[PDB]
Symmetry: C3
Subunit: 334 residues, 3 copies
């Protein structure tokens, strides 16, 4: 009985970090409590001042990543403050019933609600807002994130050998549909509601104006780069709640990848580029062997370099000439 099980209260952290957690654990099922507060706000999404009338869980795109173990129960309190304009809810792809919880979490501004569900399937799963009649708008405006349900004994390779990571990063990729006026410039809206009609028209073209990691062009580049060192194993969680993407680590690989994101299935190894289906989260493990600045991107290179779907990983350590060596540097042709 879930009512009898012990409870824990997890504190969420902002992407791209993931709140501390055990991988393999000796604990039995618990009811893990989370709270998220919805924030509608106007956000600058590129380096030329373009704005999005955005909607978020906890003020971030993506929302924070929630981590539990298979057999736990997720107990979320969802808060929609009176300062917001729209109704909201939450659909957990990791949950069973009632449209993922959406039917049980409809909160108008000034309201909150608490949902419990059993996390009985391991994997990374999208959660997103889904208010009746407004679903794609709320999703593309920023209302999604990841629930990671780890196996109780941690991640395993296809032969059952234990796989372990030193840190986890969470990347949410957002296809944005920002309207333009007759002058060809992006529109700037005074309120969230005023953006709706024009945005739906752009959405229907199926052509994003921007595709961004974690809420903005360059959100994870230069100074905001993810970090690691040679010998470190990272888990890269990638969510896309609305549209396909194809992650790639430039100069690296997916050592073990669950592209459909479900840990009871064997991962694939040595991937150059993997595939996250729109409406899902997937995960890749990589152990760094070389130092330097890597790019992590959507390998539609137009989507990456022109539209914004690219970040960096800065990696410290010693160079390995066995793996790669410049034999002859750029020089005149003889």
């Amino acid at each position: 009985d879930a009512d009898k099980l012990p409870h824990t209260k997890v504190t969420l952290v902002a992407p791209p970090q993931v709140h501390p957690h055990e991988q393999a654990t000796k604990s039995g099922p618990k009811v893990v409590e989370f709270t998220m507060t919805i924030e509608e706000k106007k956000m600058v999404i590129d380096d030329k001042g373009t704005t999005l009338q955005a909607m978020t869980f906890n003020g971030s795109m993506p929302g924070p990543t929630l981590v539990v173990h298979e057999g736990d129960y997720v107990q979320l309190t969802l808060v929609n403050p009176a300062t917001n304009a729209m109704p909201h809810n939450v659909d957990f792809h990791g949950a069973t019933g009632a449209l993922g919880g959406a039917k049980l979490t409809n909160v108008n501004p000034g309201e909150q609600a608490t949902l419990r569900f059993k996390a009985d399937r391991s994997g990374t799963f999208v959660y997103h807002c889904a208010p009746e009649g407004m679903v794609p708008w709320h999703v593309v405006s920023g209302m999604s994130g990841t629930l990671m349900v780890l196996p109780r004994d941690g991640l395993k390779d296809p032969q059952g050998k234990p796989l372990h990571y030193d840190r986890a990063y969470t990347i949410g990729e957002f296809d944005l549909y920002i309207p333009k006026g007759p002058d060809g410039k992006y529109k700037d809206y005074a309120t969230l509601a005023e953006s709706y009609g024009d945005t739906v028209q752009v959405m229907r073209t199926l052509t994003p104006s921007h595709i961004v990691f974690n809420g903005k062009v360059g959100a994870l580049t230069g100074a905001n780069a993810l970090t690691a060192k040679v010998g470190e194993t990272v888990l890269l969680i990638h969510s896309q709640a609305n549209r396909d993407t194809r992650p790639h680590l430039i100069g690296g690989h997916g050592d073990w990848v669950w592209e459909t994101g479900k840990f009871a299935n064997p991962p694939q190894r040595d991937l150059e580029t993997w595939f996250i289906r729109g409406g899902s989260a997937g995960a890749a493990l990589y152990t760094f062997k070389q130092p330097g600045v890597y790019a992590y991107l959507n390998h539609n290179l137009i989507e990456a370099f022109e539209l914004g779907a690219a970040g960096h990983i800065k990696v410290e350590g010693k160079w390995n000439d066995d793996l790669m060596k410049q034999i002859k540097a750029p020089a005149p042709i003889p």
Copy 2:
């Protein structure tokens, strides 16, 4: 020798149903006879009167699902009545040789032909019309469906345990390319031939005007919902002959999924969203644990909610508070 084998005559039924069949069977190879009759007709495809100059097998989009077992021979008589305007044929992705049968089944209006092939590979396979020089037009206008070749001993999980379904549903998803006039309204054509030029121009933009399950926006919603009950296992067959899609069951999962659709391969479990490659059919098993109205949709939510790629499943039974419980209903924030 196939000429010596016994014959059966299957009666096809309209989607979303699939004609009755055995899963595991004790019978040996048979020549299974089918007949399909092509119907060109003008169909209303949305709730605002938009029409498609459509082309169908048996009057439906998709055409009916044909079901045989591995080792059987499919013997199809394809009829093109004199009331039709165009030539047609059939390409079975489940068949080997002669462009899937297309080269052997070219029928002008007033003609019919009979094709036999060995169904020697298990899986769900697209069949579609493919007249030389007219292939994509006939496909996007509605001429596709599924051939399901079941293993003789039924479906199996990755460890070889038997998997069984209580009912099968077939969903064909159709990316439509309906032209517009200078006034921005969809064009209405007096004849099939008159629609061709304008439609090709829309096709070349790679942007569907509509994306519909089973021939129309809302074809499987509200009153036309698929049905099931708690404890029932359903097989959801999903075909897309021209364009990728990403099926998702809201509030459910793919318990076992063959997204590439070929039953000799191990399925994946616990999928939130799967991927049907354009030019293929895939299949998912799910056993319902919760009652209520589910949505089954393409999880590009714009494609689903704006363009039409969404249906419903109404499920009877008793609610399970262990799996999901509303702890605190929507109420004022303290």
Copy 3:
């Protein structure tokens, strides 16, 4: 130590052929030497005179396929002749570190460089040019190809049985973004640099004007068809460095397919259509059972038949009536 290992100098051949090589080999690790020379040139890409200001490795789209075995070291000399206008480099997805080698191979016109890396992961891997700030333009203009790293003991099925091919073909699929003028006709540019601005604008629409195999509409059709005979096993290598595709053999199958392209993973069997993620190369084995002309295409049939992503395979041999037979030829309906 790689410095001590023996060296070999491979001679590359033009697509769609792949240079001769052993599959299973008794040799140990070697340093395999290759040279490629970059050629910028204006190429006609369709049957109506449309031109692309193209960029190539070795004068071909795709660049030639390089073949080594797991454990070998690839040692490439990359030459950028003074007759070229732009800087170039190379990023090997099969390599570890320095952005796949791009950071170590920056060559201006008149320069060359030599890169070594360990091919320690089996599979087909994209290589492509990636000059800082110019990456997608160089890729979509033609600068990609495949590195195939074979397992030392050859290809294996999921149960470890040996798989062998009689010939290998390499198909590079190129999404092209050719600008149009106010008159609706494709633009023709005097120089490569003059094409840049207009091309970037088309790229940003995410809608290719053409999608071609091996550099041109019809590059592998009619007289340029791939060839085989009944009983022959072919490996079909398919690369797409920028955009997804979904290969299909009309009248055939993928007997064994590594759609993510990495040979340490078990292949899938009996595929009708597979999926190459943009930024990757995959591979399919097929043994021909029927003679005739097959089509090999991207099964978005608009992309294939309207935009150019289709080729042919002409297959000699004896027809098999067991696999497929015309029972009744096209004739009047009784």
